[PDB]
Amino acid sequence: VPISPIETVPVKLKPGMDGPKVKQWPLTEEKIKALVEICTEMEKEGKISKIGPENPYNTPVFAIKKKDSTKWRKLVDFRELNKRTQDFWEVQLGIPHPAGLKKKKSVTVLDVGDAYFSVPLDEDFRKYTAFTIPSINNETPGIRYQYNVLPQGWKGSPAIFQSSMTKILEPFKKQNPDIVIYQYMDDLYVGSDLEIGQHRTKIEELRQHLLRWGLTTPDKKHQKEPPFLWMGYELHPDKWTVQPIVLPEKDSWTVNDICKLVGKLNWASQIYPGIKVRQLSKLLRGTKALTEVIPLTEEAELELAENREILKEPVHGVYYDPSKDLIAEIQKQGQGQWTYQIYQEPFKNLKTGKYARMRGAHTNDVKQLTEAVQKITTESIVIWGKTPKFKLPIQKETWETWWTEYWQATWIPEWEFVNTPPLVKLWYQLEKEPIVGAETFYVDGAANRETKLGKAGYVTNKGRQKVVPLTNTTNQKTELQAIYLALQDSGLEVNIVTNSQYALGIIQAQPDKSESELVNQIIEQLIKKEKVYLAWVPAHKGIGGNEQVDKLVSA
Amino acid sequence: PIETVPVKLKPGMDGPKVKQWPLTEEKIKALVEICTEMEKEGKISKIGPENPYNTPVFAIKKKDSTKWRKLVDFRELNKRTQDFWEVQLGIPHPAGLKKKKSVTVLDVGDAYFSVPLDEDFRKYTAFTIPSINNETPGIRYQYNVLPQGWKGSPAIFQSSMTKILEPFKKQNPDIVIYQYMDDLYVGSDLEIGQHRTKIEELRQHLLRWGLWMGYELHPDKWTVQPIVLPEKDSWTVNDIQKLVGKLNWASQIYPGIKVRQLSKLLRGTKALTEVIPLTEEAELELAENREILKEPVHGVYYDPSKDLIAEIQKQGQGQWTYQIYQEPFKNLKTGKYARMRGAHTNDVKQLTEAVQKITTESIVIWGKTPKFKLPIQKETWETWWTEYWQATWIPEWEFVNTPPLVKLWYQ
DNA sequence: CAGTCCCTGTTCGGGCGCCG
DNA sequence: GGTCGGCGCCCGAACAGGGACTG
Helix, strand or coil: CCCCCCCCCCCECCCCCCEEEEECCCCCCHHHHHHHHHHHHHHHCCCCCEECCCCCCCCEEEEECCCCCEEEEEEEEHHHHHEECCCCCCCCCCCHHHHHCCCCCCEEEEEECCCCHHHHCCHHHHHEEEEEEEECCCCCCEEEECCECCCCCCCCCHHHHHHHHHHHHHHHHHHHHCCEEEEEECCCEEEEEHHHHHHHHHHHHHHHHHHHHHCCCCCCCCCCCCCCEEEEEEEEECCCCCCCCCCCCCCEEEEHHHHHHHHHHCCCCCCCCCCCCHHHHHCCCCCCCCECCCCCCCHHHHHHHHHHHHHHCCCCCCCCCCCCEEEEEEEEEECCCCEEEEEEEEEEEEEEEEECCCCCCCCCCCHHHHHHHHHHHHHHHHHHHCCEEEECEEEEEHHHHHHHHHHCCCCCCCEEECCCCCEECCCCCEEEEECCEEEEECEEEEECCCCCEEEEEEEEECEEEEEEEEHHECHHHHHHHHHHHHHHHCCEEEEECCCCCHHHHCCCCCCCEEEHHHHHHHHHHHHHHHHEEEEECCCCCCCCCHHHHHCCCCC | CCCCCCCCCCCCCCCEEECCCCCHHHHHHHHHHHHHHHHHHCCCCCCCCCCCEECCEEEEEECCCCCCEECCCHHHHHCCCCCHHHHHHCCCCCCHHHHHHHEEEEEEEHHHHHHHHHCCCCHCCEECCCEEEECCCCCCEEEEEEECCCCCCHHHHHHHHHHHHHHHHHHHHCEEEEEECCCEEECCCHHHHHHHHHHHHHHHHHHHHCCCCCCCEHHHHCCCCCCCCCCCEEEEHHHHHHHHHHHHHHHCCCCCCCHHHCCCCCCCCCCCEEEEECCCHHHHHHHHHHHHHHHHCCCCCCCCCCCCEEEEEEEEECEEEEEEEEECCCEEEEEEEECCCCCCCCHHHHHHHHHHHHHHHHHCCCCCCCCEECCCCCCHHHHHHHHCCCCCCCCCCEECCCCCCCCCCCC
16 A cells, blocks of 8 residues: 555544444445445555454445435444544634635635545554445445545544645745635635736646645636635625525424524525524424424514515625724614624625524613624624724713623723614613602512412501512512512602612613513513612611511511 | 653543634734744644644733733643642742732743653643634644743742752842742842842843843732721711611621611611611610721631632722632732723723732732632623733633622722 | 522533535 | 534523522
């Protein structure tokens, strides 16, 4: 067996575990011919070699059809080998995005044919890649081979090829510094500001540089004319767009059909602005079976019709110009949904996106807006290595009041206010000092763990009083219910004295939406008020009427 | 031609496997220039995916520093080698360093590149350099010498360090020198003028052995933030309610605090803005509780076997309070920071500045870095904290969400 | 007193999308 | 078909840690 020009990667097994010993699956006679034809050709090319009985290892093997071709692909079920093979640190940290590409004069894209089969395997590790190929007769013993290159299905094959490919491209990129090479697996995006003449010279130099290591660049996958098909996009000299996305038009929708629908809607939301999957994701909650048929809700049917109408019009994104600033603008779409556009010139979006993750049981729009700015920033540093300037639908005074008064550390980068309704604002403000001439409500409530029964009410300085019995409630729910009573039965200005850290910890965060309906009713009552002052006092200390009422709301 | 000191992990503990977080353009360009230069000097070398270990890497600029500085987040690796730099090659902490009139810090991290690393341990110093928009896969390296920011580097270099400092410690026996991580803390009671002169003498004394900035401190002027009660002449129901709640919370630290006579004033369902005269028995309970807050807590002392914990509170208006403790309510030190960089505009910069100041004081006083309870959401901190870091070490931290109780640590 | 439970937040396992 | 790695989203179940009440 000849020596490959590429240096091999030393691979070990995990300490104290032996190679795989699994029996072969029964294969159809149509896949048997496809494997014997490929195995006899790979053996002639030195990619697999025969092995005798001295190799006690074996692993299953099969084959699937190639897309839009009569050729077959050989795959190995290395599930038992992957478990006992050493762990690898993947070098693929992410996926490149076309919005991060810069305008280059000339662009070329090529693919290496059979990338894994052009990189050698470790000599001491070839023994564990033993498989059997069944014949057309079940009584024939079969031919046993072992891999001399990177097999497909092994958990170390992509990590090894990505690092070995980079080492081959390092000397070329060291001699040609101004040439940009986007290396993703075997797909190569080569671009340069050189003239179209010297560009194809450097391309042929690269196709010969890769040829010296056993990497073939077929002219079939060679691309010299726009539009280029790269990473599932369509690269034009001035714009880009995703390859056509097809949504299923099922008359009856299962759970797996919605998962494929949501998956393509999220993939489409990177350039198509305004995609919403709120009501469609509400169909996936609390469901158990993938094949379970589920009808579409009226809010889900309206959401799907809007997404289909957005996909009808053509959209396109531009490329990144490092000479101009980066701008990101957010909009409050639905209750819990947000959309944004990153651009450098107005209406020429680099890319779009959405953020709608619900964090916590209680929140407000300012919290969700801050979460969106952080998601956009990290996404921007991945693609462009810098933070964009933000156009936020929130008043400068609104944000100033929020972060200065919040007890947590919070901050937004350099941003400016855009007047795009709906505006993000604070719906109520708790006073810092007690209100003079306002009725003072001493609330608090309690419950019983066994009976699930409790009371809730208040006593005021003007003699006002109320106690309400409650069924199927908790100590926390009663303390909230007590404050809700004080808000309901008071004027526009009211002082409320509680002893519930739980109730106070929720209200001071200034939420405008909650998963609990009682909290939303407390929110709705707080918005109606003009001045509200909450105050916490320790319980069981005989404090004011808060002890007199704690005796009324004992049982 | 130097012999390598054999280093092993703690028993039953694999190496660090921490992913690399995204980096800005100015940080990536600085890391590529430094790593290519370090690889040219044989300090590091490229590796492949057969090394399953990885440690995050980013770059910083110290206070008033133009040059970028490579920083590795060896916090996970340091946790997995803890028995080495504490049991075998520990560094004694001088209890007099915190008593000096002036203490200067010097970055001696460049000296660790002179000692080779054990061949079997180099597998764990692996790190990956990311690329913008994932243009190229991860460019991985591993260390061939003693890495900066690893707690095993000053332990191995300690024997070589003492022999270099011996001529200077002999000429200056009253000067205290402590070494923590890539930093050298030099303290002396000399006048500020002759102090910086002795620092320059040590700079040239270290340049002749193959080693430059300085950061001054003044531990004798470090003040603590006690718990203080207001001095009101006219008290309302709302005032006494806040006073009782504050005293009820402070009773967890000072067990002698009583609120019996005070909470008796709040017994009627009175209006919060109503003025209440203090009874004779309540005026005595308040004055006595003020005297207990002046006394030190009973039974508080530093335990070298326990980890330090630091809590920080955002008091607004550029005010930040903190407490250091090993056991709850047994605070070893309290304090408050005010008017730091980013005040009245950037909370994250102030919090980053506060953590650096607190960790620095923890090194001078005890020689340990505390674990911080940060009052910030995890996603907010992990997005911006690298933009304001100006220190060669990184403390451990967790994120808390405690709404304000009775504003205990600030009036 | 240590034991629960009421509550909230986080982490992870698993489905899809997309790329090779 | 039921191979591998990477990134993204959405969900629920399991984990986990603090506060108030109870033998």
